[PDB]
Design a protein around this ligand. Structure first.
Ligand SMILES: *C[C@@](N)(CCC[C@H](N)C(=O)O)C(=O)O
Ligand SMILES: C[C@@](N)(CCC[C@H](N)C(=O)O)C(=O)O
Lengths: 279, 279
């Protein structure tokens, strides 16, 4: 009986649920796992709920990963939700921005004239205790630090965008055996709440190629928080400028670590694919 | 604007289109590829059209694989189509069987009282010219014959159920590196029209475990024609009885090589997942 709309942001695909009638998500994590199953269900990297605003926000977003876990933010999902909300509001919409409550804090997507969505993703979180990771002391940053994974030592940088990211810079990202090594990063003991893992090939100081093994979703075609975190990591390690294209398997995102306010801005598309109803 | 219903037969999942208004399929193979894309489209192993009957048949089935190619039959798809047709006919349905025209010939699914669908899949085709394959002369069978794949020689048996199958018996089907070796069977030069490839572990004379690399669809969770062909191969090679369970990753099928009429009967489920409309 559940009605939904399928979206994707650069092939990071989501089931969107109009949940404006209640602050309680209309499906359980267990049901979301069934729904995200690509053969037996709808198939998605996650379920995103459009929920009532909290205080001084227009709406709230909660997201369940395809493994049923609930992360604190999702950049591609915020873009999809912004597009969904605009569709729900129709001609009642009277602004080009939404203030969206998330577990990580208030996130503000802006619908731009060319059809993209530009998102104020907030300040990046750089201390180990904020990731969280045990690679360093809680009040220390985590920049080009060692992480032993299956007996090979990787150089990693950790950044949180509300959710954890572990970024490593590589010479040939297409050559990374992502299916094998991804889960070994995700579940590494150094990450108490698991991590997302980004492998980054620096093409130039304004162009990064990224592949990701996501916490709770595995190999995805794109990750907005991960692209943000990777850009931050590239700046922290002196490898890139603060404005860059991040090329993902599904396409490009434009990432800016603003010098005006030190917040991360992420611009990309959001596509409506189909509307549906569960049997 | 295209309306569809998502089904799966043991996790071999399909987009079903009500195409009764015209003998022309509502979409092109190119569009089918886009619709079957799991991240950018609906996601499926294929698109199945419920088409008008052809002289002495109730309906016609055409199927596009997720790579856009058009195979001659599909067992999981026929079961899904029979369920779909029963729903479309509703209370106007006046029988428990449909005669369905396919490229392979007339196929007759039967709606059984317990909710399963039992299909008359026709006579198996055993000659090399009928597969087609060049492993043997056109008028010879292909039973426990050699096939070199990447310098390793495999023992194979070929059977056609209207579409080509290449079956090899293994000790541990779970250990087969299917992502790697599957495509090398599929596109082997011995198979002018490519082939479906089944790896079979015989548990007992009435119980086969199957994994499949499908022509035009890759790793799937189930394949009805493939299970049929594998049972035939197991009988031809003396490894199984003519009545067996074939356990697929998505669940079991009951296969019978009837001694009454020498036709193959396949019984299994069909599940309606959701209805949808493209944006
Ligand atoms: C990659 C992304 N969808 C974030 C999804 C949540 C992530 N799997 C986690 O568990 O933290 C996004 O930001 O676009
Ligand atoms: C798996 C299949 N859907 C067959 C699909 C067609 C197959 N991929 C081919 O190209 O012959 C079935 O019989 O259940």
């Amino acid at each position: 009986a559940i009605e939904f709309t399928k979206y994707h942001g650069l092939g990071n695909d989501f089931i969107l649920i109009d949940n404006r009638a209640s602050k309680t998500p209309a499906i359980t994590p267990e049901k979301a796992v069934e729904m995200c199953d690509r053969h037996f269900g709808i198939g998605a990297d996650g379920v995103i709920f459009a929920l009532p605003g909290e205080n001084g926000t227009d709406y709230t977003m909660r997201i369940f990963n395809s493994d049923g876990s609930e992360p604190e933010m999702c950049g591609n999902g915020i873009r999809c939700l912004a597009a969904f909300l605009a569709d729900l509001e129709g001609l009642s919409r009277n602004k080009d921005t939404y203030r969206i409550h998330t577990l990580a804090g208030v996130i503000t997507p802006q619908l731009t004239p060319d059809g993209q969505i530009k998102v104020d993703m907030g300040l990046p979180r750089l201390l180990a205790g904020e990731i969280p990771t045990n690679i360093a002391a809680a009040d220390q940053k985590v920049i080009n630090q060692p992480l032993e994974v299956e007996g090979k030592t990787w150089e990693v940088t950790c950044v949180s965008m509300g959710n954890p990211h572990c970024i490593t810079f590589v010479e040939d990202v297409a050559a990374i055996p992502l299916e094998t090594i991804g889960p070994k990063f995700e579940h590494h003991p150094a990450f108490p709440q698991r991590t997302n893992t980004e492998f980054i090939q620096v093409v130039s100081r304004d162009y990064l190629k990224m592949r990701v093994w996501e916490r709770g979703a595995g190999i995805t075609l794109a990750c907005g928080t991960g692209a943000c975190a990777s850009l931050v990591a590239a700046v922290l390690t002196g490898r890139s400028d603060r404005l860059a294209t991040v090329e993902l398997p599904g396409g490009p995102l434009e990432i800016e670590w603003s010098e005006v306010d030190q917040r991360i801005y992420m611009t990309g598309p959001a596509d409506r694919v189909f509307t549906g109803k569960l049997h």
